[PDB]
Ligand binder design. Structure first.
Ligand SMILES: CCc1ncccc1CNCCCCSC[C@H]1O[C@@H](n2ccc3c(N)ncnc32)[C@H](O)[C@@H]1O
Length: 613
């Protein structure tokens, strides 16, 4: 996505466009004839201002792509005249070099889920100092839209956030994670952004919604104060029993006295929430009577919530995907059983030459405990492919905890080559599916190279991967892909220009939470076979029976990774550490029930095309 997917949903958000158009109309008609749009994007708000009757509008845009996009959009609405587009950061605008005079109004949307994270403060400190007329002591004085913001917080239970920042278990498929290894997420990048109005498994409010801070965007003396201001130590009373998983954060923008917009979680709004995961506590269970403690500081750009507590030893930093992995139990229970079945078929004497062990290579991209599980099964010499030294220490300490004598687990990294001179691999684990929901690049090549390093009857895991698909009517996937005409942009012609950058395939999708309608059943779209390349789909057609009548907009897809013909891992399972993906159609097709719809699935290297025929 060269053009950020936020651009599509926000331009389709008719409410937001109307609230901003009314607020700018109000300001213009009250004398604000000179407007500066910071982060103009497609330049809709700048076009609003000129349409409202502003004399001169100046639209600055950081991104080259978005700047060139606005030039076309503004030019195409026959408004190139009174609006100057500036490929620049706000900070680098100078009067009179770039803009003739100081402006009487600033409009800005440089706002993320945690409000401050797109540098609105720094931008508006500069604006008052250099670009804006003096404030009120109208065409005489300068003002900003939005005028002010109120930042809210809420302690929440949410097992979906939990499984991404905390390792919930003490034992994974036979191996024990020692108490002396403390797994922390990277958020211990201070907040993640989630559409909490549809987060899988929902969330529960453990506290009442509380006020984290306020900001007056029309007060320069206040904005300059935030960098040095001492953190606000607070404690929020608990109102419901549950597990403290995160502090869910949103805000309310006051554009003017009459118009406001909230990022409060809602299936009506497009807005996402700042999620501050809770970790590094002995217990997470909170009850009515207890207090959620935290320090709030906005000193260096981001809103920070540190020192989260409740009032009534090696550290291994894992990625969220790696924590999710450690919590994906079926994945590890499957791998344990699938490996042992192969260890039994080769040399069942070695399953729990004496000096010769089972050679097991794990080529999993990131952190993985598959080698340890293997080590517990029999006379096995397992190899780790972890790069990070922090990961090596953790796995060494896990190995110690699972009664491995020193140097039992080896580290391959410090090219796919034989384990020894005249010895071959009994099992080779490969990384087939990206977290994105697409196939790993050069998987067929690594699979082919790996086939030749195998012992007689040895196995690459997974042996094959089936991609499953689904016909869905999803307005949501459609409205996140392409702008729906002119109506939503309030008569302005922007859709034909932004929709040039239409993504064919949506990645990092939470299929489970997606609002859509199934028009079919999950159907096998292609086979990717690691043991037998010949059974790989080159470019095959699939006949999909249409179970429900509706407007086909997308084909969500996931995988069934087969370790053997019996044991299969699902990349769409509840505990899955993979996200799913979807082919979104450029033009939606109306499908009738009882109809045998054809899909043209082309597969080359790790790329897959799906089209309606
Ligand atoms: C509650 C949050 C939220 N929830 C849900 C969806 C969306 C969103 C919010 N939107 C999120 C994507 C941030 C937009 S940034 C606005 C646009 O303006 C540009 N920009 C950014 C800073 C800047 C500058 N100093 N000078 C000039 N242009 C500047 C950026 O490159 C960008 O194109």
């Amino acid at each position: 996505w060269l053009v950020e997917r936020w651009h599509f949903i926000m331009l389709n958000d008719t409410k937001r466009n109307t609230i901003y158009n009314a607020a700018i109309q109000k300001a213009v008609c009250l004398g604000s004839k000179s407007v500066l749009d910071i982060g103009a994007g497609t330049g809709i708000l700048s076009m609003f201002a000129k349409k409202a009757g502003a004399h001169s509008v100046y639209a600055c845009e950081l991104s080259k792509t978005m700047y060139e996009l606005a030039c076309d959009v503004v030019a195409a609405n026959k408004m190139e005249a009174g609006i100057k587009l500036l490929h620049t950061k706000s900070l680098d605008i100078e009067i009179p070099k770039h803009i003739p005079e100081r402006v009487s109004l600033v409009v800005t949307e440089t706002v993320d889920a945690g409000l401050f994270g797109e540098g609105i403060v720094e931008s508006l400190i500069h604006a008052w100092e250099h670009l804006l007329l003096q404030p009120k002591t109208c065409e005489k004085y300068g003002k900003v839209i939005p005028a002010s913001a109120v930042i809210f917080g809420m302690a929440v239970e949410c097992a979906e956030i939990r499984r991404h920042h905390r390792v919930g278990i003490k034992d994974i498929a036979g191996i024990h994670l020692p108490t002396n290894v403390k797994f922390q997420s990277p958020a211990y990048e201070p907040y993640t952004t989630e559409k909490m109005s549809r987060v899988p498994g929902g969330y529960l409010a453990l506290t009442e919604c509380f006020e984290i801070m306020t900001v007056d965007f029309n007060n320069l003396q206040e904005l300059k104060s935030l960098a040095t201001k001492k953190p606000d130590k607070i404690g929020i009373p608990v109102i419901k029993e549950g597990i403290l998983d995160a502090i869910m954060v949103w805000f309310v923008l006051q554009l003017d006295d009459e118009h406001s917009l909230s990022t409060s979680p809602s299936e009506e709004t497009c807005w996402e929430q700042a999620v501050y995961p809770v970790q590094d506590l002995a217990d997470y269970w909170i009850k009515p009577g207890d207090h959620v403690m935290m320090e709030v500081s906005c000193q260096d750009c981001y809103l920070r919530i540190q020192s989260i507590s409740v009032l009534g030893e090696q550290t291994c930093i894992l990625e969220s995907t790696e924590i999710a992995l450690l919590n994906n139990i079926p994945y590890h229970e499957g791998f344990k059983m699938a490996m042992s079945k192969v260890l039994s078929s080769l040399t069942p004497e070695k399953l729990y030459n004496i000096l010769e062990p089972f050679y097991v290579l794990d080529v999993s991209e990131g952190f993985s405990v598959l080698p340890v599980i293997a080590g517990t099964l029999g006379q096995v010499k397992p190899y780790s492919s972890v790069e990070k030294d922090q990961h090596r220490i953790a796995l060494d300490l896990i190995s110690e905890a699972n009664h491995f004598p020193k140097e039992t687990l080896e580290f391959w990294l410090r090219m796919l080559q034989r384990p020894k001179s005249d010895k071959l691999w009994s099992i080779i684990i490969l990384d087939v599916i990206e977290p994105s929901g697409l196939i790993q690049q050069e998987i067929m090549e690594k699979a082919a190279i790996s086939r030749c390093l195998l012992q007689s009857g040895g196995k690459i895991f997974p042996q094959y991967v089936l991609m499953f698909g689904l016909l869905v009517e999803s307005q949501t996937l459609l409205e996140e892909n392409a702008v729906q005409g002119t109506e939503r942009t309030l008569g302005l012609n922007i859709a034909p220009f932004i929709n040039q950058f239409q993504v064919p395939i949506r990645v990092f999708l939470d299929l489970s939470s997606l609002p859509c309608i199934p028009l079919s059943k999950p159907v096998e779209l292609l086979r990717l076979d690691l043991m037998t390349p010949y059974l790989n789909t080159s470019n095959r057609e699939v006949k999909v029976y249409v179970c429900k009548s509706g407007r086909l907009t997308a084909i969500p897809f996931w995988y069934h990774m087969y370790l053997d013909e019996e044991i299969r891992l699902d990349t769409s399972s509840e505990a899955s550490h993979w996200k799913q993906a979807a082919v979104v159609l450029d033009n939606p097709i109306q499908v009738e029930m009882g109809e045998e719809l054809v899909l043209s699935i082309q597969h080359h290297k790790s790329n897959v095309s799906i089209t309606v025929k």
